[PDB]
Design a binder for this molecule. Sequence first.
Ligand SMILES: CCCCCCCCCCCCCCCC(=O)O
Length: 288
Amino acid sequence: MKIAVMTDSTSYLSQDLIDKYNIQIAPLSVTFDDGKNFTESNEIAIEEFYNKMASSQTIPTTSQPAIGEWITKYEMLRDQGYTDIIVICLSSGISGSYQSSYQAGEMVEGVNVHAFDSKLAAMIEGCYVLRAIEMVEEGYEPQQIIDDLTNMREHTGAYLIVDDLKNLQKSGAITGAQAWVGTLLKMKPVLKFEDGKIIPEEKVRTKKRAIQTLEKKVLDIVKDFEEVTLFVINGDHFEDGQALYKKLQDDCPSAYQVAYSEFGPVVAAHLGSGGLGLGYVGRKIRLT
Ligand SMILES: CCCCCCCCCCCCCCCC(=O)O
């Protein structure tokens, strides 16, 4: 037994962690209305991506890692001599990345692939990667790891706001919002993940109150957990995420782990400007 853990690029792990644990990444891509396209990487400058989004008449589209792209990486990892690969994927509710990971797996002989649907995205998805690597070091077997991650998924979630619903709406990434259309009476939309899909949760009158709602909803859930990791995941409005992070640092006991991350271009292409998420995991995830 030699277990490897990999993921797709939308887990948005820090390059320090990718380098420390030698995490292989199957990248997603984004394409703009002028045909411009690029692979997701920590080498991309996120501020320029938002600038290009803003100066686009048409919202940009994204692509899962082609089914051939995973095969290459398992084959790569096969040829390195690993016997089992745990694969943490973007939510199957919003992306074909998970299925293409599963279908690619069935195609590579000589290694056992265990694809796992995180049912979330960004560093909340990344937390499953970090949990899986920790368990491998602890001597756990692949089925024990998948079982543990499944349990973790029962106590993981996220709420989120965006400036305008158009990107989520036009890209088909929001569910159940066919009535919120029609000049959504100003009132900021608060959304949440449910069973891997993004659904409306509440409509609040201001963006500051949307941020307060993010905090209230998540704190009321995680007060019942034995272990708590919170992630503020910010889009392009710096003060948005700084405010929420500072507030959580003040309001939460130090027994809660409170961390900060950002959206990369694939997720940002569907959120648009002003994205801000607050996610939670009922575990003390190893962030180092
Ligand atoms: C605190 C966590 C916040 C998480 C917010 C995630 C927002 C996801 C928006 C939809 C992204 C869809 C990407 C699909 C990629 C593809 O397969 O083309």
